[PDB]
Design a protein around this ligand. Sequence first.
Ligand SMILES: *[P@](C)(=O)O[C@@H](C)C(C)(C)C
Length: 212
Amino acid sequence: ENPASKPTPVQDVQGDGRWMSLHHRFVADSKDKEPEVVFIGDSLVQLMHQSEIWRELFSPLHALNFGIGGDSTQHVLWRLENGELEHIRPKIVVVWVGTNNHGHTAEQVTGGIKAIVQLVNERQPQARVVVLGLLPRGQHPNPLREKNRRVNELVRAALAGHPRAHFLDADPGFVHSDGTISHHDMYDYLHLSRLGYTPVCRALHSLLLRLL
Ligand SMILES: *[P@](C)(=O)O[C@@H](C)C(C)(C)C
């Protein structure tokens, strides 16, 4: 099987049970709330909630943020199948995951993303699905930049004839002419600074407004 599309939780090898705690909180969120928009994915999704941009752009939309740092596609898939889509009927689900899929080919990662969209199409058939492209990373040109680009190309091709699945490239051009990414946009060449989130969230918020 494609390991990217075989649903599995993150095994606790540290001992504090943080991953399961987050999942359980999100499950409780879905049990208690009636969101119109559900965001799910990795640290890029999660930290969007920690910015002041969230309360100004996305809170008004009645949204839940189920991002978990370190998640790969198969982890998001497991979470969606194991409680996080229960007791809700969102209009839109936003998916952003795949940059952490180390050891998976771009094709496998694409397969994991397609599996996520399919599951959402089954459990929440009324919802439109928005998939964000994987952002570049690393200070200089490197294999992960090519990988994420290739995933974006493949995912975009997969979603193009899917008329309630929407591929969104939120990258305003973080990779400059000299091939570098500024630490002002990504403080560690992966996570987005407040300045980095600005054009990304603006792009997303715009799309969400059109669909909604
Ligand atoms: P995001 C891209 O999930 O950040 C990850 C790699 C951690 C630093 C492990 C949370």
